[PDB]
């Protein structure tokens, strides 16, 4: 679809009634460190991911049942499920986390982030893209659209996570590979991404229940967790809504990640240890996932203003977004 300009975008944005809604108040703000066992985290993974990791092709449970596969799968999953049992027993490998919740009001394609609640100082920005192309009765959405405008004088919040399934993932890797048991070395690899992603499951449902409590009663079993039949979304960066990558960086500081769960990012800031994820709250109902997409370079200009970038840095960052030939 042929791309529109920003201002077009921008004036396409989500249309919602910002002074007829009153955005549910996070119940505990600031940042909390966490953490999670490997029992607990267990009955949040989702498994057809590791079965996947093992090129096989099923969803799970049913894949367990595959008249051909289902014997190798039964084999993997029990092997899967002695190795959580004994790093569960060893302590061996400790999921840790960190969440927090902030005063925030959008801004514009941006959400200022602030001190506290007189929302006369800004803290941090989450910078967000706007999707670039003519959009059939659909806002051209960005992720600061769910917020409240701070024009709107309605008090709203964000939250950010950063999650890991463990600090010991390499060490535990490590071993298995000097010895050529790249069997296991795969599999306490491809176990440690799922207590990850257990974790930002598991955090996530604690604070739509209590850190910001906007859905105290839920009661969700996993498979309608996985299904995401839950209010809200829990964007990552890297991901399509927010494909820009150096915001990682804005988590980093403001949950102070490194400082309380040893976690770092890398000059192409990529997480480790590997097994990690990082992210956003948003509480709207209308909320959703979507890709940015194509880009146009007056986007790329007004991004790089806001975020104090040459636009050829920013370059480097969206090029797999650019709907334009860069260099
Ligand atoms: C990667 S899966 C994780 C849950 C799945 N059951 C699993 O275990 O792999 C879905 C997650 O990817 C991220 N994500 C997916 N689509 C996204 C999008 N379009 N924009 C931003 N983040 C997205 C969110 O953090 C979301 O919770």
């Known amino acids: 679809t042929p791309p529109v300009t920003l201002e077009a975008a921008r004036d396409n944005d989500f249309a919602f009634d910002w002074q007829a809604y009153t955005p549910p108040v996070a119940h505990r703000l600031g940042?909390?460190?966490?953490?999670?066992?490997?029992?607990?985290?267990?009955?949040?993974?989702?498994?057809?991911?590791?079965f996947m990791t093992w090129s096989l092709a099923g969803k799970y449970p049913r894949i367990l049942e595959d008249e051909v596969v289902g014997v190798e799968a039964?084999?993997?999953?029990?092997?899967?499920?002695?190795?959580?049992?004994?790093?569960?027993?060893?302590?061996?490998?400790?999921?840790?986390?960190?969440?927090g919740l902030f005063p925030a009001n959008r801004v514009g394609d941006d959400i200022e982030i602030y001190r506290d609640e007189t929302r006369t100082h800004v803290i941090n920005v989450s910078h967000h893209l706007r999707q670039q192309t003519e959009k059939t009765?659909?806002?051209?959405?960005?992720?600061?659209?769910?917020?409240?405008?701070?024009?709107?004088?309605?008090?709203?919040?964000?939250?950010?996570?950063?999650?890991?399934?463990?600090?010991?993932?390499?060490?535990?890797?490590?071993?298995?590979?000097?010895?050529?048991?790249?069997?296991?070395?795969?599999?306490?690899?491809?176990?440690?991404?799922?207590?990850?992603?257990?974790?930002?499951?598991?955090?996530?449902?604690?604070?739509?229940?209590?850190?910001?409590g906007y859905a105290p009663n839920e009661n969700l079993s996993n498979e309608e967790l996985i299904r995401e039949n839950y209010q809200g979304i829990r964007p990552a960066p890297g991901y399509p809504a927010c494909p820009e990558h150096t915001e990682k960086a804005t988590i980093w500081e403001l949950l102070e990640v490194?400082?309380?769960?040893?976690?770092?990012?890398?000059?192409?800031?990529?997480?480790?240890?590997?097994?990690?994820?990082?992210?956003?709250?948003?509480?709207?109902?209308?909320?959703?996932?979507?890709?940015?997409?194509q880009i146009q370079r007056d986007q790329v200009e007004d991004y790089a203003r806001r975020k104090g970038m040459s636009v050829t840095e920013v370059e480097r960052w969206l090029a797999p977004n650019l709907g334009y030939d860069a260099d």
């Not at 460190?33 to 590791?50: G, M, Q």
């Not at 039964?74 to 960190?98: H, I, Y």
């Not at 990529?270 to 209308?286: E, K, N, Q």
């Open 258 to 293: 490194e400082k309380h769960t040893g976690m770092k990012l890398t000059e192409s800031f990529a997480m480790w240890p590997g097994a990690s994820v990082s992210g956003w709250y948003f509480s709207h109902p209308d909320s959703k996932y979507y890709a940015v997409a």
């Open 74 to 99: 039964q084999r993997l999953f029990k092997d899967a499920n002695d190795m959580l049992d004994k790093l569960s027993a060893e302590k061996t490998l400790n999921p840790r986390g960190v969440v």
């Open 137 to 212: 009765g659909f806002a051209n959405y960005c992720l600061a659209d769910f917020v409240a405008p701070k024009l709107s004088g309605k008090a709203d919040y964000i939250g950010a996570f950063a999650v890991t399934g463990g600090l010991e993932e390499d060490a535990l890797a490590d071993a298995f590979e000097a010895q050529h048991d790249d069997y296991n070395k795969i599999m306490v690899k491809a176990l440690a991404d799922r207590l990850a992603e257990a974790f930002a499951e598991y955090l996530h449902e604690r604070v739509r229940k209590v850190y910001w």
């Open 31 to 50: 940042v909390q460190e966490v953490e999670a066992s490997i029992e607990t985290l267990r009955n949040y993974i989702d498994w057809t991911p590791f």
